[PDB]
Design a protein around this nucleic acid. Structure first.
Ligand SMILES: [Zn+2]
Ligand SMILES: [Zn+2]
Ligand SMILES: [Zn+2]
Ligand SMILES: [Zn+2]
Ligand SMILES: [Zn+2]
Ligand SMILES: [Zn+2]
Ligand SMILES: [Zn+2]
Ligand SMILES: [Zn+2]
Length: 233
DNA sequence: TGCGCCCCCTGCTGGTCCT
DNA sequence: AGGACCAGCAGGGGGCGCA
């Protein structure tokens, strides 16, 4: 007589298999507890596997490289890196993948809509993968003990994002102000040339011809000669 | 019950692609 | 260039078909 599960359509050869199944899916009773953490498992084999994680024992060793695993399947999975075997194939684009989890990620990102994308808490950027947001946080926003100087100025920064933000702030910016007027140069040579143009001030100018003079006396004697209002031929 | 077998999930890594 | 992208890749863990 087969042993039938009371709560579902499962049949087992022996009573032990049935009580094991009910513990896994129905009662969630895990009687084998670890002596070092809170882990409990339905089977002793799972607990013994979990203990290998505590002790770090790696009995299965790869015949190609130095890799050793705590499980046989992990070593089989590792062999795909040497063999280049890509068993799992996408059922839409027929793309090859090494692991089933990799394929699950692919169909999520490249074949599903309304995907929850993550926003950076510090800057206004959106990232598809959660782990890539971690890469963004570790690279852009993490403190740096050795400050990096600005390529354009002498300010120094300890955060990559602030440095790039400030470096981007020098776009279309004129490094020279030309105190005497509103001119603004960027080539550092036109500013020298513009400085020379200001030297010939000549504030005084004639009201009847284009000539200009540095001294009021020079202007007036020019005016009294060329532009006399009561000249008689 | 033991255990291999496969599937989960998670998250970092290093080359690729898009602006 | 530079950074998101994308698959590669290894960690711990679940259920059960077979012995
Ligand atoms: Zn059941
Ligand atoms: Zn433990
Ligand atoms: Zn290897
Ligand atoms: Zn696909
Ligand atoms: Zn950010
Ligand atoms: Zn700067
Ligand atoms: Zn000027
Ligand atoms: Zn004049």
């Amino acid at each position: 007589r087969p042993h039938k599960c009371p709560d579902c359509d499962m049949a087992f050869v022996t009573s032990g298999e049935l009580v094991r199944h009910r513990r896994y899916k129905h009662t969630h009773e895990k009687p084998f507890k670890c002596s070092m953490c809170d882990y409990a498992s339905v089977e002793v084999s799972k607990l013994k596997r979990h203990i290998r994680s505590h002790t770090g024992e790696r009995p299965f060793q790869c015949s190609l490289c130095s890799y050793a695993s705590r499980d046989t399947y992990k070593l089989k999975r590792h062999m795909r890196t040497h063999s280049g075997e890509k068993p799992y194939e996408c059922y839409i684009c027929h793309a090859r993948f090494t692991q089933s989890g990799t394929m699950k990620m692919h169909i999520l990102q490249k074949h599903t809509e309304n995907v929850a994308k993550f926003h950076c808490p510090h800057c206004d950027t959106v990232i598809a993968r959660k782990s890539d947001l971690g890469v963004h946080l570790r690279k852009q926003h993490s403190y740096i003990e050795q400050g990096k100087k600005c390529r354009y100025c002498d300010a120094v920064f300890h955060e990559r994002y602030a440095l790039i933000q400030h470096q981007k702030s020098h776009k279309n910016e004129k490094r020279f102000k030309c105190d005497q007027c509103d001119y603004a140069c960027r080539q550092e040579r036109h500013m020298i040339m513009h400085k020379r143009t200001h030297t010939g001030e000549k504030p005084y100018a004639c009201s009847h011809c284009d000539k200009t003079f540095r001294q009021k006396q020079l202007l007036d004697m020019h005016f009294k000669r060329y532009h006399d209002p009561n000249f008689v031929p």
